[PDB]
Assembly symmetry: D2
Homo-oligomer: 188 residues x 4
Amino acid sequence: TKALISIDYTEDFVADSGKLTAGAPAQAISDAISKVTRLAFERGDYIFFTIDAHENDCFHPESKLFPPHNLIGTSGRNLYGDLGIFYQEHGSDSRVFWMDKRHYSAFSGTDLDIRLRERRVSTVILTGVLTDICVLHTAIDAYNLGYDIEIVKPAVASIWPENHQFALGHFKNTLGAKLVDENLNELF
Amino acid sequence: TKALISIDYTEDFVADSGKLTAGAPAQAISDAISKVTRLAFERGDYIFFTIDAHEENDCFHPESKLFPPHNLIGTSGRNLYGDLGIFYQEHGSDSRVFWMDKRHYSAFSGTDLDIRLRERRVSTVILTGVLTDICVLHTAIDAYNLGYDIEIVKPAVASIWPENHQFALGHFKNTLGAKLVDENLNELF
Amino acid sequence: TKALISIDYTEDFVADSGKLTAGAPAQAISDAISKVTRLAFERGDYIFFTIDAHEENDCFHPESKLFPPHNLIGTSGRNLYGDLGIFYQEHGSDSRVFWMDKRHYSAFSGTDLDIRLRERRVSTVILTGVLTDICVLHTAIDAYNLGYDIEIVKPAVASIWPENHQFALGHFKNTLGAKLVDENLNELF
Amino acid sequence: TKALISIDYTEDFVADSGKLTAGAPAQAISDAISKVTRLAFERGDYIFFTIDAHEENDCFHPESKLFPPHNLIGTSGRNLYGDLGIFYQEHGSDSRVFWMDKRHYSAFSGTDLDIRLRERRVSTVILTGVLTDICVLHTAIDAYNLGYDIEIVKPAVASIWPENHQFALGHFKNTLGAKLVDENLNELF
Ligand SMILES: [Zn+2]
Ligand SMILES: [Zn+2]
Ligand SMILES: [Zn+2]
Ligand SMILES: [Zn+2]
């Protein structure tokens, strides 16, 4: 049994009127990200929604770098597409988690590692946005914490195609990650 | 300039009808713990309420087998005891006052406490609450390993067992190099 | 998959002429600590010697104000005491045996212990060495927070203070959920 | 009070005959990386050499499947390249200069870097070395999560891939909020 991590696939990151939207490339993965999450859950895997929870926060260095996004209590934090429907169906399940984060990495200042260790999880499966920012930082932390890594290629996206390509190369060649499709089958 | 950490001073830990109550010794520090928290706030310090947030039937938590259900989410058992609860009603919305849910004994474990303290370049933590030999001890040890200067408010920490309370105070002073202070934040000799 | 951790059982902590010696109580566990280590090795367990590596004079270390110089790098005080030292000379080159320098009390703090254990998918640590209420206690608490199952070899841990040794053993069993075992690795009830 | 981090600038990563060499682009920064390190030292900064220390036949290390053997313990591959190596011969024994073995890409992973930095109350790290998109990138991300202000010496970092070098620099500035500086430690606009 593995764990699938769903990173920042919310209105503010995906929708056209989103505060920090990736636009077309992020919208394009909506079908794949929902399909792969449903499949992982059906298999018995743990699902962790790791979602930006921002505040107005003078002490956060990220405030100077990006405009306000994923603000607590706003509709910008709602999950985009059929993924949101999956959460409506199974959000209260013991195997499904909602986790607020303040840094890019899903591990930083959270209890993600603790929850995975409780369940003796050795492999993480990464999905969401952006490939070169919150997926990259999460993957690097996962590597340093000794997890096997899988990346769902058609269920990650970035605003810049060149940055998306760098990150995929980094996952495979530096982190030793397995690149998989929406059916959780290894790509060659 | 500094940060005060308020550890688990809730109804379940302090009140007579508390699910994991420390009883009389925990109740006896109510005046001192509220006094010292108000004083720290008045002089500009950051206040971190680090409170147990447990779920019953959490079979993956090793603590579930060691203690009865306590500080359950949505219950009155998580409410702060005494004038400390009044202080949170008054100033809990101030930018310098925080509420942090925790699952382990240590206030640092699986939380963003270290990140929040580093954002503010805090070098010294002041520890209060219960129990001296469990959630205060674990928090103090984590603080030591993370390079913080440590202050322990002696009249604002308590345990069920006098021998355990005394071990912990000895450990703080002689092994961690912590300063023991009174409810007026003055060094005890 | 289990790993035995051998904490600070060196000349400076054990021998009569040691710089920070626990003396007779530490000397008393020599037979049990060497026996349990050889047994763990025989059973295919990983063995980690986690040993204080201090410098005189380390200005920036908070420990320097609390204790006299001990376990100094390149000195005979860092030599393992008794048959445990003979074991290391025999099997130190084996891929399952490790020597790890540490600067804090905990074996995990600032080391790659957690990394090496995760590489091997170790779920249980077995703790031995000195002192029960300082470098063993700190290692145990870190192990707990990192999700490891814990075993404590009761006859292979020791302290200079008997009351502190008792607190620690109680803390291990009642707070950390650790298993207390003997030198044959059998659970004590 | 700042700390300069010198990452993997050794024979195996830089020299033409190095086992995992970045080649000409890495060799091209030799003048700048030595100059900036000597400058930092003169300004009273701390200097940390954080250097890969791998073992041959380390089957438990995930890196062993990804790259050929490199920076093996006790081999010439671990020797610092260029004037940096001369600087270390001159000032390695100074209390402000450190040598740290590492096994992961990041200088923080499984080391005591964070501990040594907090001991000195360092709030800003200055990064140099190779490769920009691997051990520099991982170190920078770790520094960011640990709340350090970050400076990157642009003419003193290098990669074998120019497009990857460009990505990393953009990532440092736009995502980590790092300051890009030259070999004179002056900000680049
Ligand atoms: Zn954000
Ligand atoms: Zn609890
Ligand atoms: Zn020591
Ligand atoms: Zn390497």
